[PDB]
Amino acid sequence: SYDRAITVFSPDGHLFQVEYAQEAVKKGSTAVGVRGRDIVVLGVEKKSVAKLQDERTVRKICALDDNVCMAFAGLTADARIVINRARVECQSHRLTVEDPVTVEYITRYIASLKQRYTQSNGRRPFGISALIVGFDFDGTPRLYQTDPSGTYHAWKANAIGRGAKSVREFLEKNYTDEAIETDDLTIKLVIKALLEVVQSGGKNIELAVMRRDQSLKILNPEEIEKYVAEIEKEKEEN
Template sequence: MGTARYDRAITVFSPGRASFSGRICPGSRKRKDLQRIFYYSLMNVVMAFAGLTADARILIDRARVECQSHKLTVEDPVTLEYITRYIAQLKQRYTQSNGRRPFGISALIAGFDFDGTPRLFQTDPSGVYHEWKANATGRNAKTVREYLEKNYSADKIETDEGAVKLAIRALLEVIQGHNLEVAIMERGKPLKMLESKEIEKYVEEIEKEKKMKPRKEAEK
């Protein structure tokens, strides 16, 4: 499959408060990558992806059914690792089936377990999955991931504002501010999309901080 057929969007997840009250998800405005997997009275799982949209819809539909089945069977919502493992195993089976091609998407799955623990997983087309504190997928994901590896720290994500800023700074390494979308997920609340004006305010603050940094270093 040629890479031209794949979604070029970038999506990043980063933890929210230090007390783990939420997760932050900024992404590219070019494609609406955020898809609700399943929600009961309140949504507790979201998936963002880069790749073939049609493949993602199939996986999301299968995941919704599995979430419903799990709820009816054990009377508890799925854990993040459970539904991630289900999606990963489904992907893996398609790599070994005659007459069927692998799913052409890389996905980030984030949300809260029923005990309130926030989780973030990534699955590859091969069916491999890993848990992360912050990650990126899509075009230029390597650059964004390297930035997060160098700049991620607990003190920077003690507040929602700090977590959003870290995620936006990482994305500004590869795309312009007007292409950003930011989604905030908090336990017990629906996914919240930040308004364009709010994102612009964050971008302006970050640009000012960048300009002030050389001055502060010179004063030292």
């Protein structure tokens, strides 16, 4: 039918298989990322704290390059493939151009790969949405979001996966220049957004911090719990 073949256009003009890939993305766990002054931070809500499992092997936030990060929401295997391809392309660009990879360049490459996989009906689209965030050569913070269709958009603050809409409303309501100015403010904003996403929070918070001229580092559960306690104290004060 119209909804079974990727290449077939629906009478309305839809490529329903791309939209089904988007639905698969929505099925994934929530990933939230905001942009700040010389501070870019990512956050992914873990679906469940599965005991007897190594958290290192199921991380959702990875580093494409020393100056670029990426978080995904959707099929994990597709995300791994896209991440490997993005890393390879980043190194190839650093080889051929000798300059550090811009966030725009890698975001465009990922979008092009996803669109190319959407081209033919033999290949299914990648069912992932990626939040590529990092610093450019000049150090300007950059946040971007790609879709299975192959469209990339810059965002000041975005959320993908399940419950993305509510977290996006939260961010829109609580995005201010003062919050962006302070790195701790941005981190607290992301903690609050993810806590809104998942009531339990705490151990389920998977937050990563990247600052100017500093490699990606993932805050340990101790720091995440400290920030959660700070948010709880602030709420109690009110």
